[PDB]
Amino acid sequence: GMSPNYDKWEMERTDITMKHKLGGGQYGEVYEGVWKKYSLTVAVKTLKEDTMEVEEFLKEAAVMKEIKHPNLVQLLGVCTREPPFYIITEFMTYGNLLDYLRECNRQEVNAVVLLYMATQISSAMEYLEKKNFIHRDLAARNCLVGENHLVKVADFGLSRLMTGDTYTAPAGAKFPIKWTAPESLAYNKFSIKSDVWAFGVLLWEIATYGMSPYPGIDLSQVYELLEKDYRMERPEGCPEKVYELMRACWQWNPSDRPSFAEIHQAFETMFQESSISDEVEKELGKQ
Numbered sequence: 001g002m003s004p005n006y007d008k009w010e011m012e013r014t015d016i017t018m019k020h021k022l023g024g025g026q027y028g029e030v031y032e033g034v035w036k037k038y039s040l041t042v043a044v045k046t047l048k049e050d051t052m053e054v055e056e057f058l059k060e061a062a063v064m065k066e067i068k069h070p071n072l073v074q075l076l077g078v079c080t081r082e083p084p085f086y087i088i089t090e091f092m093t094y095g096n097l098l099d100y101l102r103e104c105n106r107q108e109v110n111a112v113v114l115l116y117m118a119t120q121i122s123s124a125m126e127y128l129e130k131k132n133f134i135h136r137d138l139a140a141r142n143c144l145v146g147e148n149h150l151v152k153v154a155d156f157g158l159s160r161l162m163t164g165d166t167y168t169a170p171a172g173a174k175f176p177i178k179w180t181a182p183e184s185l186a187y188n189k190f191s192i193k194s195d196v197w198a199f200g201v202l203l204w205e206i207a208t209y210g211m212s213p214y215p216g217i218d219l220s221q222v223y224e225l226l227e228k229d230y231r232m233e234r235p236e237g238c239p240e241k242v243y244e245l246m247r248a249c250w251q252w253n254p255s256d257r258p259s260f261a262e263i264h265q266a267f268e269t270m271f272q273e274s275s276i277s278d279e280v281e282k283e284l285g286k287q
C-alpha cells in the first residue's frame with residue numbers, strides 16, 4: 001500500500017542540481033542538471049512563471065510517460081505539482097543532430113555513420129507508427145546525439161496519439177514550411193504519412209551534413225514548387241538507393257509514401273552491408 005499522493009513519475013526539485021542553459025536559448029528554458037541521488041547528468045526543461053503555455057507543457061510531459069524506445073529520448077521524471085514545472089530526461093552528451101552534423105569530423109561521421117543515424121531514427125518512427133502516434137516535428141534539430149553515434153528522436157511537444165487516421169491542427173497554427181507535407185500546409189492535415197514526408201527532409205539534412213533545405217528558395221514559393229513536382233536534388237555523394245527512398249517520402253499523395261516499417265527495413269539492410277564493407281576495408285591492414 002503506497003502513500004495516498006504517490007506518483008511514480010514525480011520527484012522533488014531539491015533532488016536536482018540546475019546548471020547552465022542548453023541550446024543557446026534555441027530550445028526554450030532547458031538546462032543541464034544533475035540527479036544527485038545517482039550523480040547523473042540530466043536535461044531539464046522548465047516553464048517560466050506567468051506563461052500562457054502551461055497546458056502545452058503538461059501535455060508534452062504526459063505524452064512522454066506513454067512512449068518508450070531505445071531511440072526515443074527517455075523521460076526520467078517530472079515536477080508538475082506546483083510552480084516551477086520540470087521535465088527531466090536522460091542526457092545526450094553531443095546535443096542536437098543538426099549542429100552535430102555541422103561541426104563533425106567527416107572521417108569519423110562517414111557514409112556508414114550517416115546510414116546508422118537514419119536507421120536509428122526510422123527505428124523509433126516504426127515504433128511510433130505501430131503505436132499509432134504521430135510526432136509532427138521531425139527534423140534534425142529535434143534529434144539528439146549520444147556516445148558512439150547513438151541517435152534518439154526528441155521534442156514531443158506536438159506528438160499525438162491518433163484516434164482516427166488523420167489529425168487536423170487548429171486553424172491559424174503555423175508550421176515549419178520546409179519539413180511540412182503539402183496536405184498539412186494546405187489543409188492542416190497530419191498523419192504518420194506526413195511524418196514520413198518530414199523524415200525524407202531529415203534524410204536530406206543528414207546527407208548534406210546539415211544544410212538548410214530548399215537552398216535559396218523563398219518559403220512563399222515552396223508549396224507552388226512542390227505542386228509542380230519539384231523536389232530537392234540528390235545531394236552530392238548521396239547513394240542512389242537513399243535518394244530513391246527520399247523521393248518516395250515526397251510522393252504528393254500521402255498514401256503513395258512508404259511506411260516506416262518499410263523504410264527501417266531498407267536502411268537496416270543498407271547499414272549492415274555498408275558496415276560489413278567498412279570492417280573488411282579496415283581488415284586490409286591488420287589480419
Ligand SMILES: Cc1cc(Nc2cc(N3CCN(C)CC3)nc(Sc3ccc(NC(=O)C4CC4)cc3)n2)[nH]n1
Nearest residue numbers: 022023027030043045087089090091092093094095155
Ligand atoms: C532532452 C535532452 C537534451 C539533451 N542534451 C543536450 C546537449 C546539448 N549540448 C550543448 C553543446 N555541447 C557542445 C554538447 C551538448 N544541448 C542540448 S539543447 C536541447 C535541450 C533540451 C531539449 N529538449 C527537452 O528538454 C525536451 C524533452 C523535453 C532539446 C535540445 N541538449 N539530453 N536530453
